Ligand binder design. Structure first.
Ligand code: NAD
Ligand code: NAD
Ligand code: NAD
Ligand code: NAD
Ligand code: CL
Ligand code: CL
Ligand code: CL
Ligand code: CL
Ligand code: CL
Ligand code: CL
Lengths: 333, 335, 334, 333
């Protein structure tokens, strides 16, 4: 299985192609569905506000892109059940619209002639994969799978490390998170989420995220043990996740840091830093998550101990590297 | 006292500030109905909490079908097609059309078919009477039913062009506005209609953008038809904009002479202000003028008998423009 | 009453101190300002504010003064506090807003220069430190140099106090998502010894040390040593939010925590309550030191192990200034 | 000459080193003078908010940087006359502090034992070079030269092409310009300039530039014929210069754009675009100026004609590519 279609050629959809080209994948993107013209999709692929010029040639015709000399069909079907995936034989759909985040909704792609769907987002109780945490759970009979959120890909490897080394008894997460297209440019209606209606680049905006709540899909032993939320802030990409835990063991900072470093050794998904980085330094990262030893904090009074651990993530490109790792493995089962 | 009943179509950046300003000046206009695409709950939230102008100055509550503002009920509708808005239910006769989707005489006709009497469009709307208050509001009369107040940029450019034309003659000119980003632009890089540049992250770029302000200035100042062009550079400020005009004038001038002429034009002028202070864009946020001429930026470049004159005016493209809209509304309502 | 004030450092805080004093028609008169610049530049900065808009009163200047709402304010430019000629106009209480005199040892220079008392707008070591309506009762007539701690302290303390009083705080850690300030950098470049502080403040999320939690014991003695925390500086111009994750001395529900907080904010000029879905720009211009936000309360529990997250907004500029002024007024009458 | 010293390892200073390494120059930076430690300089070189991680290894010792395995001395001398340029034999100083922008001030480097100085800014009445406009004016007797400002490097090539093809009779420019370190993060004193006191990331701020005023040093024929100024705005780097001119004959937009296309042909200093780019697309440009045919505008009323031409520039890196070009030539004379 080598032929892919992308539904939603947005921030994530376009970076999916960029990354596949970058790693010289044997996956072949044959079709793209969105809501617009090839002309506009070509413009957006070529010029990127966060990552700069597309490294390959880009042209278009009235119904296709031509990327690095290869033709990619472009469709504009707002209902996935109408996407003509069989025309170019798209077998695996990378589902990056935000409108099909359940097994029932993504079933449309299979009805439309595809064989498998990989959803770029949480999608309820289905196989949900953070690469290098639970990718071994992908199965030859899986047809619809989720890679959860960027935040999940940031939290999970840190949570796995901690839990494996020390035990996590309970914990709460706050991500300080780059603004995304689900937010608003100027104050205006944005469905039922009132906070989402507020000007994103001019505000700190509290936001609900399921990353902690649904972590049991990725690390079953942590089911129900974590909660958390996001503060959306005015940076264009690059985010940071803080986790405050009660661990099963008394620890030093050096001990937590040492365990995290071991977990990141030879781990292409999970990086380590002890440099005093800031968010722009994570832009373009090829990890899902980069644990930051410099922010580790142990607060102890008598017998009680809280442990704060912190990890960076490029919620666009870093997350995409994870999605592609998952896609490559998925495509072979 | 004329008590005209008003309806607002599009309770957006402009539509919400229209209400704010009407209450602020204690207008005799009664806003009796609002049409948008959402619930009273959401509109109440947006009216109360404003990222640019802070807490609404009056109480705001909602019911299942209304806003209650300072104790007065305003019916809320959600008809995406204007012909279906029940403007007759609360007697809304003048519609302040602020959706961006009815910017022509043919499209705003739907408000009249739905039972309103008059429409004031908060944007350019092609070949119709187009009013910059204190420039050409004298051209209004009792027979007008659908009128435009043009763009924020027009409201900035027109008083400055008028003053220059009246004092010196403008022979030809070009404008560039360095302009706050607005809701027509994009939060993240993504399709935004057919304008390629408008697809790009607005808070992260300088983005060239076309504006008709200079091209259609002739609707406002007929003598300058076809003598002006220009465009915008959209930049990452949330509101507050500035318009530069480079002109060949009908006579040789000094900067002092230009500045004095502009000062005279702003004296006892509620619409057009003047400054010789070294202000920046956040200083214009909340302006009660459609335009403020900035004498500190005046520049004369002269070689032999050739002269280029650069004149610069700030504007709050949100609230400042709204003050112009309301002045035109209060006049248009009484005719 | 002491009634004559000098401001040292007519900066974000110093200018807003004057604004607030005139807004509340205090009987305190500002008779002198010291900074490093000209009256022209101070008048320009006072008239024009990027965060709060035009100054609400008339502003003019001479070669050695400001004239504000028709009242003359002397302007000095002495970089060393000991040299400031405070006695010329009888400045009694110095509001110290430069950031350069954050200790009793440093700020006593003002006294050498002829002042009677100093109120420092920042943490200043282990001196008496006041969060209004948390421990301002500890002030007395013998206090000569006093601190009002940081904006973050003023946000954190009334929340911690309410929780501690109702339920007990056994241990906790704070993270404040905090507007950038003048201590940061516009473009990437050296900013003393702190590496992170060198980075472009409007283009990054920047981890940053704060003493608010560490030194909370100056303000709430029973929590001495029980809290730690830090900041993430982010690109908003003012308006900040503080999260505290606590182990409490009692099993609780979110409603119970929210009700206790609501009670503590009733008839409390310093400490507000909200259950509206606000964002940071809605706190800009707040007249509170701290606004507890019920919408963000979260209780995470497995058996007897319970974490409690509580969240309060604060306008680190003006809201903090309202606290500084409340303290100042009281300080002036002891 | 192949040994360079950098004074002011700032935005421009650090990028100078980056660009020298990128083009594999035979110039070697042997010393750097600034106001801080090697540790802080190394941190700053390594992690860049605008251009991302440094492409070569960077380490530090107590007295130096190690960059790509080579040692560069670090000094911290506030006054240029005390800088030990002779210790490592620094021959040409790239003067990037902003405090020595005159022949008389930059003499202190020669007094301290350097042989030449290239100033990264306008520096009064001395030879002022925009590469591929007037670098032919340099000779072997020059010892202190200027490469003018970012805006000068943007303006000059566009003015040269217009004036050569059509004649410029008079003109005024406005650059819509990224904020720089001369501005203020929060409202507060910043020298005598009132507008420079105001928070740069939250305002449009009118600001002087002498690029047009002193354009005569670069294009003597245009001396006294141009004025202009800037509007500093909240983007981190990437700028755009508009020039409104009265030309020496009647033109069409196509005529202007073809003349500009021809001037940019085989021109390493000066680029052309007819794509609908925005400021983030110029970040990391290897040109001093990129003329933009999409924004050309002719306003004609009988005999009277205004011509508006627009060119992008990366005021950091793009400018630095011009600085290095001039540097490489200056080193050989
Ligand atoms: N941006 C992030 O940080 C991030 C990170 C991880 C996951 N995700 C997830 O990926 C998905 C996409 O996010 P994004 O940031 O790329 O969003 P985006 O808005 O940039 O892109 C969505 C794309 O889908 C297209 N689209 C919308 N509705 C459609 C439909 N019915 N049919 C076809 N195309 C349609 C749009 O035109 C757009 O090009 C979401 O589920 C999101 O939660 C986003
Ligand atoms: N700077 C400014 O923002 C500014 C200045 C002057 C004029 N204008 C003009 O005013 C108009 C509104 O601009 P804005 O910035 O308030 O835009 P906006 O997007 O903030 O508001 C538009 C509002 O209209 C609603 N809407 C959209 N389609 C609708 C429909 N069919 N029926 C009912 N409601 C609908 C939206 O839900 C939203 O509340 C545009 O014509 C614009 O050009 C804007
Ligand atoms: N900005 C905030 O959010 C905030 C909140 C609470 C407390 N604080 C504290 O208040 C103090 C001031 O902060 P700010 O944000 O107003 O800083 P700022 O940089 O805006 O103001 C500093 C002022 O002091 C002047 N100054 C510097 N050194 C001086 C000296 N030796 N003598 C006289 N004047 C001098 C400067 O010129 C400037 O006007 C600091 O201690 C800071 O921690 C700041
Ligand atoms: N930033 C731009 O866009 C740009 C473009 C073209 C030219 N320039 C010019 O280049 C020069 C540098 O600008 P920049 O943006 O890199 O400024 P910067 O502020 O980023 O760097 C200045 C550097 O010099 C150091 N410094 C200050 N005084 C010093 C001294 N006396 N001795 C040694 N080091 C000292 C600082 O610590 C800092 O590292 C200026 O003259 C500027 O006009 C800047
Ligand atoms: Cl949760
Ligand atoms: Cl989130
Ligand atoms: Cl035009
Ligand atoms: Cl701490
Ligand atoms: Cl802080
Ligand atoms: Cl000039």
């Amino acid at each position: 299985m080598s032929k892919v279609g992308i539904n939603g050629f947005g921030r994530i959809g376009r970076l999916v192609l960029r990354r596949l080209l970058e790693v010289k994948s044997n996956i072949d993107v044959v079709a793209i569905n969105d809501l617009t013209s090839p002309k506009i999709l070509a413009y957006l692929l070529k010029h990127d506000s966060n990552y700069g010029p597309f490294p390959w040639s880009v042209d278009f015709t009235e119904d296709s892109l031509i990327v690095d000399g290869k033709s990619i069909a472009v469709y504009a079907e707002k209902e996935a059940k109408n996407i003509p995936w069989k025309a170019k034989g798209a077998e695996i759909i990378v589902e990056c619209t935000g409108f099909y985040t359940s097994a029932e909704k993504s079933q449309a792609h299979l009805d439309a002639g595809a064989k498998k769907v990989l959803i770029s987002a949480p999608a309820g109780e289905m196989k949900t994969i953070v690469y290098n945490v639970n990718d071994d759970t992908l199965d030859g009979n899986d047809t619809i799978v989720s890679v959860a959120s960027s935040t999940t890909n940031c939290l999970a490897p840190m949570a796995k490390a901690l839990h494996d080394s020390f035990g996590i008894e309970v914990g709460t997460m706050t991500t300080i998170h780059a603004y995304t297209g689900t937010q608003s440019l100027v104050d205006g209606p944005r469905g039922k989420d009132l906070r989402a209606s507020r000007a994103a680049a001019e505000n700190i905006i509290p936001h609900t995220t399921g990353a902690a709540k649904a972590i049991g899909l990725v690390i079953p032993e942590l089911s129900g043990k974590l909660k958390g939320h996001a503060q959306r802030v005015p940076v264009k990409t690059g985010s940071v996740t803080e986790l405050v835990s009660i661990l099963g063991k008394k620890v030093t900072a050096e001990e937590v840091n040492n365990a995290l470093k071991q977990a990141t050794t030879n781990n292409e998904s999970f990086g380590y830093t002890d440099e005093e980085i800031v968010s722009s330094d994570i832009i373009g990262s090829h990890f899902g998550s980069v644990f930051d030893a410099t922010q580790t904090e142990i607060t102890a009074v008598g017998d009680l101990q809280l442990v704060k651990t912190v990890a960076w993530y490029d919620n666009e490109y870093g997350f995409v590297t994870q999605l592609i790792r998952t896609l490559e493995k998925f495509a072979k089962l």
